[model samples]
Structures are given as structure tokens and as C-alpha cells.
Target: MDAKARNCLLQHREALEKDIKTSYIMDHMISDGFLTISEEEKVRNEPTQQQRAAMLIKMILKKDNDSYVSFYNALLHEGYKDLAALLHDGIPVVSSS
Candidate 1:
């Protein structure tokens, strides 16, 4: 299981980039209140570890929408088992196969 997870993480090398782009879009939506200016500045002043991805995923899941499909796929692609499992009982939300 560890080897499988490691291999999956290696495959989607752009996972972190994709996650960042998604969060940026979300920030625009919450530009009014969610992210503060000081917090945003502090964030760029330090190194990141995709620390917000899981939190953002849960935020999305907290509401219901067709967006589940995209988030689930992204989470799976990024090998995020915990958040991915929260949607569709650990099943892919889309019918790709």
C-alpha cells in the first residue's frame, strides 16, 4: 500500500501546481473576507507545503455541488486519500471508465 501510494504521488507531478491554481480561484471568491492581507503576505513570505489543499477540499465538500466531480478527481490524482474518501464513498465521482 505504501509503495502504491508513493508511485501514485510520483505520477501526478503537477498535482501541487494544480491545487495552487484552484486555491487562487477560491481566494478570488473569498477576497472579501476569507483570506486577510497580512495572512496573504505572510504566506508568500514563507515556504509552502500545499498546506491549504486539504482544508480547501473539506470546505468545498462542506457544501454540495457538481463540483464534487472535479475536486474528487483532483484529490485522487494528487493521492489525497482522506479528503477524496469524504466524497462518493472513496469512489471516483466521475464515470471516466
Candidate 2:
């Protein structure tokens, strides 16, 4: 991940850990091919909501730039506007492909 984007994730880690509801976000991420069923299951295996969020975040930390964009888009799609804003400055640009 890019430093700016990684730092942004870290900076808002607490807020996300406290407020994120993983299933919905994971749904979008999975469909976007940024997340996998096993990973989602692992996140679900966590006992608490915060823990689940943390687990997901941990996985994201190791992913590529596209993963970050997927996460941001998922947030917006799910109506997590404030949460999306927190990650706005770190949004990465993708290749034209």
C-alpha cells in the first residue's frame, strides 16, 4: 500500500474499529474482488465488532492500492460518508489499464 493511504488507514483506525459494521463493507469488497470469502469468514470469526473491523483493517493493510480504493468505494456505497471522508485524502489513483 502507499504510505499516504496506509497512514490514513492507521490514522483513522480507531474510528473505524469502533464504528464499522463489517458484513456490508465486506460484501462490496468481495464483489469488487478485493476481499475473499475465507477472509470475510475470518473477520466474521472475530468475537466482537471492533475485533472484526480490526481484522479486516489488518488484511487491508497488506493489500494493494486497488484494495484501498475498493474499501473507500464500499464505504460510500454503504452510506458511510463520514468514514469515507476520513479516507478521502489517501485515495489512490489507479492505472488506466
Candidate 3:
């Protein structure tokens, strides 16, 4: 997957692990092949600019929204350019398709 997506997943790893555990019990079963396929699918199915922008705006305006804003800004400031690029480019492709 692209850097942004990778970082997003990393940042939320614990939460993801918890959710995945509750849902599928497959969190620890993720091997390289599974990760590769899942990442490919995620990259191939990312959000569009409009959708992301809308979600961002909505997130910022929601109650107790600082957490998301902080995480997003942190990613941007950390020079996560690949992630940003993925967001900018992938979103539209996913949206249209």
C-alpha cells in the first residue's frame, strides 16, 4: 500500500487489532501474503477527494473531533507525502469507479 495508507493503518494498529479480533479473530493470522493482498485491495479502493474532504470537514466539526484532527495534521506534518499523494490521487479514482 502507499505510505499514507500504511501510516494510517500503523497509527490505528491497536484499535484495528481490537476490532479485527472481535470481528474475525484473524488479526494475528495476517501473514505477508495476506497483508500484501489486503493492501493491494485497499489501495485499489481508496476514497476520492470530495469524499475525503467532506469526511475531513465533518470530522473536524464533530464533537470531540480533536483526536482525528490531531492525527491527520500529525501525518501531514511528518512529511507523509506518499500518504497525501495517495489521498489526493486515489480518492478520485475510487470515487469514480
Candidate 4:
């Protein structure tokens, strides 16, 4: 992932964990090819919503630039515009793909 994107994820970790509902966002990200089914399953199976958010964040941290962009786009499309704004500065300049 781009360094800025990674920092954005880390910096916004608490805000995201507090409000994120993983299912819809994960659906969009899955469609965007940023998240795999198994990864979604792992997050879905977490014991609580906050844990699910934390787990998803953990996974995204290790992904590439496109994954971060897809994640930001997913947040925007899924009505998490405030969260998207927190991440906006870190969106990749262009997809590495």
C-alpha cells in the first residue's frame, strides 16, 4: 500500500472501529476486487462489530495501493463519506495495476 494510505488507515483506526458496519462495505470492496471471500468470511466471523472492523483494517494494511483505493471508494459508495474524507488525502495517485 502507499505509505500515506497506510498511515491514513492507522490514523483513522479508532473512528472506523467505532462506527463501521463491515458487511456492506465489504461487499463493495469484494466487488472491487480488493477483498477476497475468505477475508470477508474472517471479518464476518469476528465476535463483535468493532472486532470485525479491526480485523478488516488489519487485512487492508497489508494490501497494495489498489486495495486502499478500492477501500476508500467502497466507503464513499456505501455512505461513509466522513470516513472517506479522513482517507481522501491518501488515495493513490493512480492504480498500480
What TM-score goes with each of the models?
A: 0.29, 0.67, 0.24, 0.66
User: Worst 10-residue stretch by lDDT in candidate 1?
Assistant: 1-10
Clashes of each: 0, 0, 4, 0
Per-residue lDDT of model 4, residues 1-97, tens digit only: 4565567776666867666656666555654666577766655665564666666666776666558667776667658787687678554543453
Model 4 clashing residue pairs (backbone): none
The CA lDDT at 46 in model 1 is 49
Q: Candidate 1 at residue 31, lDDT?
A: 42
Clashing pairs in 1: none
How many angstroms is residue 75 displaced in model 4 relative to the true structure, after the best TM-score fit? 2.8
lDDT tens digits, residue span 1-97, model 1: 1233323323333543464443554444334343344544444434457644434433443443334445446556656766455434423322442
Q: Quick one: how many clashes does candidate 2 have? A: 0
Task: Go through the candidates in order and give each one's C-alpha lDDT.
Answer: 0.43, 0.65, 0.36, 0.65
Give the runs in model 4 whose Cα sits over 4 Å from its true position. Answer: 46-50, 90-97
- TM-score rank, highest first? 2, 4, 1, 3
Model 3 agreement with the true structure over 1-97: per-residue lDDT tens digits: 3334333433443443333221122212222122333533332336453342233223222323233334344446657555545434542344454
**lDDT, model 1:** 0.43
